Design a protein around this ligand. Structure first.
Ligand SMILES: [Zn+2]
Ligand SMILES: [Zn+2]
Ligand SMILES: [Zn+2]
Ligand SMILES: [Zn+2]
Ligand SMILES: [Zn+2]
Ligand SMILES: [Zn+2]
Lengths: 175, 175, 175, 172, 172, 172
């Protein structure tokens, strides 16, 4: 059912993000199980931190880590885990962990859901506070997980985010 | 999965309502996507208003607008989006918008879920405050959406609500 | 989708519990519908009580009452109804109601989700307060439901809980 | 501040209830400290129960047990601990406990706050569910506290509640 | 305690707003009782609406209607009723109602609490959505109270808001 | 009201902590204003972190920095800002920051509120997770405030916490 959600109506400008974790929520790290399509509790986060945006993935995408492309979606109110939001990518936070590079895309609600993010075209239009919060969160959220750590390279633009979407959409397509 | 929820055990007295939006919640207007069966964020409501009851639809029904029949369900506590409640229709709020007539049925929890609505047989048994809140909500909730408005005709009885259920159940059945 | 959730990765030490009702929540008694797989509102609980743990079931199990095996899962934060948690059984509360014996297993989050329950190997490792709360809840929660009551026998160990899991997993398997 | 809240505008028909505990809330039993006037955590409730209504007291009253008159107030949404609600008494639940007799008044929001309770004149106009819940709650909430118990004796009417208010206003 | 909160550190550019109602909260209209200083439930709102911002007053001010100056304060998370927020006025919404003229100031968190509102100097720097919501909220929230209404006249600037603060500080 | 809360019933073993911030709550840093006694919004926290325990102070204490003694209190459910909890000190976390040395006491609910913390006699009886979270929280929560930092030095025992309470009680 979540397994049948499209990657988007018009990828990569117009995508759907399947939400796993709300912004500002308790430290329960939910993940959609690939086989069942169900919402699984993956971990109880150990640090006293919360995701600054809603966090989820684009369906029918395959990152180089073997999981779908991760996305953060700011909204005026937290979303329900398992809900799906139509959005437009505007940027991407690049980083490295105990297993190679990682990226966290950022996408904003689509103009048909709200007009309040229309002026966010690219990564520099986003509030600097929000960006600095996101960066800080990912550097530190796994600090108390044994054998796990993260370090942040920096922020890239919407074109780079779209390229990640496309490469991973094409990579999942090709077996 | 929600796609496989019946219209009811004994339509139109005994129906199931698939809940999309809780009573008294943040202004996130969720809708179940017809193809996928998933819970999609349709809009971030622009007015500072909330639904006075839980709001959802009856599955396997086709209104003249092309969507399933909408229903409001009062409960003592807000319900989870994506949950399904067995109820009994008691009434219907008629109205017109930028696209023709619309109706919002009202149904109360079934006696097997709670005895507290048993005395609500027809539309005049409902609290007048609740009715006036519902009417006011629908007149005003789209006031700040461009090219959108609503105006309310009035309240009709349980027989009329059941007729809407039946006509739309039969209309979906017939291709 | 919840219908396709396994009983576990390695039953009966390593099981999945499909959550229906969060700990410390409003008195809405949700149940997963067996046919549809959807989350149904079964009852509005009449007593002013809440479940001391999250409450759910193990999929692909058949108790002697005809329903899957019920499980309580303590967590540091309440879980979302419809989510799935990997856990390890440590005990079981035995009791009788208006229809024969019943058991409520207790299982703790699996070590891959959290290290905080690792020291809970068997039923006596659980906080005595929590146990006494669970026992009291089940004795009294149906006190105001007509023709319904419950009485508690006592607590049995992890081996007994695992035997219930196995017997009901094998019972569902065999038509 | 809470120390200076009136017992009421026109006692006993028109009173103020200082709220200590919301309806449907976590099992934290707050109580206003008499000396300071501050909101104290009195207990973490041991049973997995919640108060069916908001719970508090009428200021400037003293019951036989030396504490102010206790009151339950139903509202359409839970109230903030430390807030003060204008209400109209309608009933009283009589009980005994480990310390002896006890009484809990029930009062509904005053007509100037809401019309929704205008029809509740007396104890029997309250919903049967809510009454049954309250009785059950008080019967069982101390079940897991050693040496503490409650036996509910019964309900009494709005005249009975008003009489308690007056008598306890005078006692203070 | 709330009775002893200053009007501000450096009125009218630097003020304190006592909060009565959170943004996005249940429809319970609290109001600080002038005599006691306690948080009273004034009304259960009849329309299914919520305040777009936190709402409260500046202490030691008196408006022509005999009540203190009312203020809306946007914050990134809702504030607790009875809490006090240091802010900077930026605007005012002018309206009339069943009692006559009314004005609601808007003030943003002071730079020492957050940098997020530094760029809001004047009424037109506020988001157009939020302004439209506030106006709509005040236009309609009393629609289901008999004999009560509001017509919004318009917005005025930060100088206008400051002038109201000063004048009302003096009136008290 | 909060100004008149005792330091404790039997300091330093039996104290009262005035709560400013709940465990697991939105990133709003409230602080009781010393002059008024009212709950002020001191800051909107910039990092996406939450306090692992409820946080507050002991009234009628003064630390070397001129502010009252700070205390963390774990509870099974979060407490209301402005509420007062009877607890028993067990430990203290020592740190330094942009202003110099700092210390945060840890105290657990008193046995009359709950038996759940009776077994916690001293710093090492606290759960290792909670201790690690607290340390991490204080290490990082000011990471996005310019010119503000914390380096955690270490934990000290229940005797050390009691000594701080006494010394700071005397300083006031
Ligand atoms: Zn939260
Ligand atoms: Zn709400
Ligand atoms: Zn709850
Ligand atoms: Zn609650
Ligand atoms: Zn809300
Ligand atoms: Zn929280």
């Amino acid at each position: 059912s979540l397994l049948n959600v499209p990657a988007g109506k018009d990828l990569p400008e117009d995508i759907y993000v399947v939400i796993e974790i709300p912004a500002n929520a308790d430290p329960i790290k939910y993940e959609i199980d690939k086989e069942s399509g169900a919402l699984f509790v993956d971990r109880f986060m150990s640090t006293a931190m919360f995701y600054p945006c809603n966090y989820g993935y684009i369906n029918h995408t395959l990152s180089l880590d073997g999981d779908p492309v991760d996305v953060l979606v700011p909204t005026p109110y937290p979303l329900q885990p398992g809900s799906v939001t139509r959005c437009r990518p505007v940027g991407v936070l690049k980083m490295t962990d105990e297993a190679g590079e990682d990226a966290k895309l950022v996408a904003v609600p689509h103009s048909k859901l709200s007009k309040e993010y229309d002026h966010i075209k690219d990564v520099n239009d986003l509030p600097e506070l929000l960006k600095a919060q996101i960066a800080h969160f990912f550097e530190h959220y796994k600090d108390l997980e044994k054998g796990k750590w993260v370090k942040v390279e920096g922020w890239e633009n919407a074109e780079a985010a779209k390229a990640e979407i496309v490469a991973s959409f094409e990579r999942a397509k090709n077996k």
